[PDB]
Amino acid sequence: GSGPTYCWNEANNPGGPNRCSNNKQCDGARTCSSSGFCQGTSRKPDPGPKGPTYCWDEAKNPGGPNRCSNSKQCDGARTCSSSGFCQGTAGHAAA
Ligand SMILES: [Cl-]
Ligand SMILES: [Cl-]
Ligand SMILES: [Cl-]
16 A cells, blocks of 8 residues: 555455555555565564554454454554453555
């Protein structure tokens, strides 16, 4: 996508892992090649520190979707509430 704050899981792409027809199907700053593969570097470091470059799929959390015991189980800049839910805005780019 557009840059390191764009988060996308390429494993599940149509046609197979890391395959694409558009830049939105590639993580971070990666873009779609002429042969239909994502190319480039998503971000440095990867994973990013907590903040807008941190990519995490909360749907898979062990306590249930969007449930947490620590803020590293929350996407982007989100943090763990006292009640054990991820909260705030992740801060990721839309594309
Ligand atoms: Cl970005
Ligand atoms: Cl497929
Ligand atoms: Cl961090």
